[PDB]
Amino acid sequence: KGGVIMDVVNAEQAKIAEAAGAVAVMALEGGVARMADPTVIEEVMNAVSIPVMAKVRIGHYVEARVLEALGVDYIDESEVLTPADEEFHIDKRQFTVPFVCGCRDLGEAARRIAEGASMLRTKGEPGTGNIVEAVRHMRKVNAQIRKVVNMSEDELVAEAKQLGAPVEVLREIKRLGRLPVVNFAAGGVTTPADAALMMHLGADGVFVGSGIFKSENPEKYARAIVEATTHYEDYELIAHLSKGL
Amino acid sequence: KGGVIMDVVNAEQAKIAEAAGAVAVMALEGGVARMADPTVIEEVMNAVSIPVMAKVRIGHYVEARVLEALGVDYIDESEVLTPADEEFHIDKRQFTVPFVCGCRDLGEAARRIAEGASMLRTKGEPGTGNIVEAVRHMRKVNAQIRKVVNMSEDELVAEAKQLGAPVEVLREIKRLGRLPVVNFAAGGVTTPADAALMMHLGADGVFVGSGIFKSENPEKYARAIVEATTHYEDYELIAHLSKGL
Amino acid sequence: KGGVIMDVVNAEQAKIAEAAGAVAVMALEGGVARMADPTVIEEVMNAVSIPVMAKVRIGHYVEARVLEALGVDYIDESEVLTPADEEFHIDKRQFTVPFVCGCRDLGEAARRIAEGASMLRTKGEPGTGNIVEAVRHMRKVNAQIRKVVNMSEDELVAEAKQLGAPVEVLREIKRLGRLPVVNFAAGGVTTPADAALMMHLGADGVFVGSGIFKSENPEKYARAIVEATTHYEDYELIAHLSKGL
Amino acid sequence: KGGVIMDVVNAEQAKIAEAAGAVAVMALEGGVARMADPTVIEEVMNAVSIPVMAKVRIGHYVEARVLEALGVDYIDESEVLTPADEEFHIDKRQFTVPFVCGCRDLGEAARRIAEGASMLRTKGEPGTGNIVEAVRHMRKVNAQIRKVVNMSEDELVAEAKQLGAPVEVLREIKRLGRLPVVNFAAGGVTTPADAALMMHLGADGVFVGSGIFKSENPEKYARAIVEATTHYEDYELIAHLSKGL
Amino acid sequence: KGGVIMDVVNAEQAKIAEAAGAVAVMALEGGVARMADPTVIEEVMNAVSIPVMAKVRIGHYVEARVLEALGVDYIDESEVLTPADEEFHIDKRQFTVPFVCGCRDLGEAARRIAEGASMLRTKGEPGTGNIVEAVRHMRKVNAQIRKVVNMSEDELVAEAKQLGAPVEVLREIKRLGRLPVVNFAAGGVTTPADAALMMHLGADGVFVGSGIFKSENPEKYARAIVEATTHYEDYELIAHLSKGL
């Protein structure tokens, strides 16, 4: 627990991610942002042994089935791609391949899960290098979990109504003490301190973007995030990793 | 199917109800309207072989355990009694005695079912002799059910959010082609034509009030309601039953 | 835990209360509602050995010193009397005699405690025989307590701000896992089931009003409430205590 | 310090007030409420040796000069009479006879003083037997005094602006630590505890109304107020005086 | 009392600050503004013997642990960095290293103290060379302190509510007659007169920014500010220190 998933655009970057100890890679391709070209997905697939993920536009059922047929390990039904369906998410229950979805609060989390999400992440604010929204979303979802875990049983139906959440998801949360799926922080995680902060806030792990490869030394920067995420209470070690970019 | 349940206040009324063909009786007592006196409930229980129901205030957990312990067959957690809890209904799952609840729409119905209701009824507008609200509720609920039954499966999570309904309950409705519990019309049902109309609109049956016994010949009037609810497409009989009160 | 406090207007009522097992009595006596005549309070003090409470107007510092000087065991700074100070409550920390105070939510509770309150009760809706408001307040305070006990420590300062609560009281709640004072349900508690219900919602006991003595047999009634409040999960007992009015 | 002034309507009542130790009497006469008939003022004047006051309508310059010519000791420019001038108070600086005026806050106090008031009182809420407004006004004026006494000197001009107060009055207040005139509580003071409460709140004394003579024993009731006002921290004695009406 | 803290970007500047008599240095280094590179902070720690401060993003718990682990003497949880958590500040009570925090009013100050802050400063308007905001905040905090010191004890609970302040911090202020921590002016302090002015408004000292080193003679300038801040009523001295820019 406490893994790092890393956005990669080619073979080279994928190998650097696996070598630095990333638990998975996310293969990436007002223009329209669609599912990545097959050859990009299969070029990344052939570079590593750790799980390969890729993105589809929200609601894009057939994009997902294409990714599934291509043999991806995981599908991000991604708000950062251009939504295909602004009202209905993919019925992920129908897929053999697992999905991760974004969320900002427990209502949203519960709905994605009712749709069949196998994994969750914060939406954060990608491309900004700013964790403030990632923090907001993890704070909100976790504070709401803590409320649910400890509230009177008979108050759950009303709670679900107010949250716009499926009540059976709340009941399962209360039974387990946590979400029935893992929840990673994502969006703006830049520094070793950022990465450890998400773990401190209750994240199960962390997604990071292409900023790692904007670096002088992607290897060392990737390593620093992986170690800071793993050893997230070693403030002495974290203080060290924050040096020299 | 096409059962009638009658409001009764003493043994004599309970016997008339039963002899007339009612499938159950409901025993009944700025004033606060609470649980009936145990002696009234036992008096009615002693009078008939058919099931006896009684009412508790909404959210009044203990009033419901009292009635459960007194051996009633069914509890109506009822909006006509002064509500005890304005925010939370009784967690009816924790009871061995079955409960009936009122609703006005599919969201409301699903929430009551999620709380553990074993039976539903329209809220209607009791005391007026006016079926207009009962018709509205039965129309609304059944129209929303027909919509759910036929809707695209991938659209039910969004639909559940819009209704404030637990999606699992919507998914069961779709699976069964109808509500998982019987839904009776209740409120204002006065004439043989009223009772038959509620059946025409899709009720599983009908609750009627004390008006029967304000009548000149309550036996005849009770039989009329029972016969019309059963033979609800028999207009020639319903016409006959309407003559002479 | 499971105490009943009874409102009494004279010695006779006070002895009935003590003998039925009350843990204390509230000595009582549209115009202005002020502190009772001392005579009435002295008459009650002499009748019984259990603690005796009386009421003062909100913010009426001198009324409180008068009751203290008379030797009452507890002061209710009471909102059912005509407030004397609409901005500032009594600085109860300056008193050797303990105060009980009304509340509706945790922020209100927390401020009363910070003024010196030693005991709390719901404000409820006195005089109505209706528990709906008492239920709302108990439900609200306890839900917020549950939330506070279980929330991140570093979120308590923000929470106190939002609630209008002193954060030290909130930190003390988290530390104990409940309020640092006892909290009785008050307002409208009428039947054995109501008294039991309040305890089910997590009250520490119940205040009850003069309705007991409007009864055909106040001793049987007073006792029934005492038994209900203490054996609040004894459903079969409660059911029996409901009969014989 | 800590005197009681008493409203009287005749010789008899005036003598009872002096005999009970009142420091002064106020001679009293949608109808129009004007200055009292001379013969009422002179009948009260001839009954006692302690100062006699009487009321004029706000802004009624000539009423005041009549009272002055009749030889009253003090003039209340009284909001309880029907105002003669809704924009301009009497220029009391022009009178040899001293005036008391009402107030609800420091701005108002300062303005009345700039007009030449020799004494102030709270407006309270006369005729209600309710001290809540008297409390509000004394609280407000005294809290504002405490603010002024201790604030940076250079912030006084802006403070005067915000309060709508003459700055030289604020400066004089800051110099003295208090108002340059006495300030009595008035309106609704009913019980010995009320009277002592005003003294506790920082009043210089107390006005009381015709309620004293609504009593079984005006003598004893008057005495009780006078003693409670004088000995306002003797909670033992006050507790005693609160008995037997 | 009369300390100057200086913002420095390197060792050279840090030694200039120490030698001119600074009581501490703030080590510093549109995109995201995060905690400085440790290298920069280590370089400053080695240059001087006076206490060294650095900044973290608001709510950035891990950044604060990193600076603690590096051995800085003080942490500024700083609003001029890009906030990491917009709801919850760092629980500074959990730290052995002391924090300074910005504020604009007493309620804000009081909440920071209740989170653990050991020192305060005005937020001011950094970067502008304009003291108007620093003046507003110092003026506001001190005016409210003065008011709180001198107000009725029993009015503090209401006051805390209105201010959004924890009442325990307000009671502690009244007890001491000032803040339980020191409070420096920060933002726009440019000239000797500004530095002196802040002290005149009742600051405990002054933070100053990088403008010192934009000077033709930073040593003379740094020293002039140190002398102005400490001898803040020495008008003739201050006037001389204004010449020779």
XYZ file of C-alpha atoms in Angstrom, chain A residues 1-92:
92
model
C 0.000 0.000 0.000
C 1.129 3.539 -0.886
C 1.952 2.973 -4.571
C 2.855 5.556 -7.225
C 1.333 5.437 -10.739
C 3.130 7.484 -13.395
C 1.952 9.059 -16.632
C 4.086 7.944 -19.566
C 4.024 8.784 -23.291
C 6.519 6.219 -24.675
C 8.663 3.100 -24.152
C 11.574 5.074 -22.649
C 9.456 6.820 -20.007
C 7.626 3.596 -19.141
C 10.928 1.791 -18.438
C 12.079 4.710 -16.270
C 8.825 4.425 -14.274
C 9.093 0.687 -13.692
C 12.840 1.006 -12.850
C 11.994 3.698 -10.279
C 9.444 1.365 -8.668
C 6.086 2.729 -9.909
C 3.290 0.205 -9.233
C 1.647 0.956 -12.624
C 1.893 3.206 -15.665
C -0.792 5.364 -17.299
C -0.255 5.369 -21.064
C -1.131 8.804 -22.563
C -1.488 9.941 -26.169
C -9.732 23.525 -27.705
C -9.044 20.251 -29.601
C -10.977 17.070 -28.823
C -9.123 14.753 -26.401
C -10.022 11.119 -27.244
C -8.732 7.630 -26.446
C -5.068 7.146 -27.397
C -4.008 5.538 -30.682
C -3.676 1.744 -30.211
C 0.033 1.790 -31.203
C 0.843 4.095 -28.259
C -0.929 1.734 -25.861
C 0.823 -1.352 -27.257
C 4.234 0.359 -27.355
C 3.874 1.062 -23.636
C 2.471 -2.444 -23.018
C 5.620 -3.962 -24.567
C 7.986 -1.891 -22.451
C 7.050 -2.972 -18.890
C 5.765 -5.813 -16.652
C 3.855 -3.656 -14.183
C 0.175 -2.931 -15.015
C -0.565 -0.587 -17.949
C -3.555 1.764 -17.745
C -5.122 4.117 -20.321
C -7.918 6.721 -20.565
C -11.361 6.926 -22.219
C -13.789 9.851 -22.522
C -16.582 9.750 -19.929
C -19.584 7.724 -21.171
C -17.632 6.355 -24.122
C -18.672 2.758 -23.951
C -17.050 1.646 -27.153
C -13.687 3.352 -26.499
C -13.571 1.294 -23.283
C -14.334 -1.968 -25.118
C -11.581 -1.157 -27.588
C -9.080 -0.640 -24.730
C -10.340 -3.850 -23.166
C -9.879 -5.793 -26.433
C -6.336 -4.341 -26.736
C -5.630 -5.874 -23.332
C -5.112 -2.925 -20.990
C -4.926 -3.716 -17.270
C -7.036 -0.745 -16.200
C -9.194 2.031 -17.698
C -9.411 5.566 -16.434
C -12.846 6.968 -17.377
C -11.291 10.368 -17.505
C -12.751 13.851 -17.110
C -9.512 15.214 -18.606
C -10.458 13.725 -21.947
C -13.386 15.436 -23.716
C -16.614 13.900 -22.263
C -18.620 11.846 -24.737
C -21.668 11.638 -22.512
C -22.298 14.480 -20.117
C -25.114 12.693 -18.299
C -24.314 8.976 -18.098
C -21.022 7.296 -17.171
C -20.063 3.910 -18.634
C -21.847 0.978 -16.978
C -18.507 -0.448 -15.827
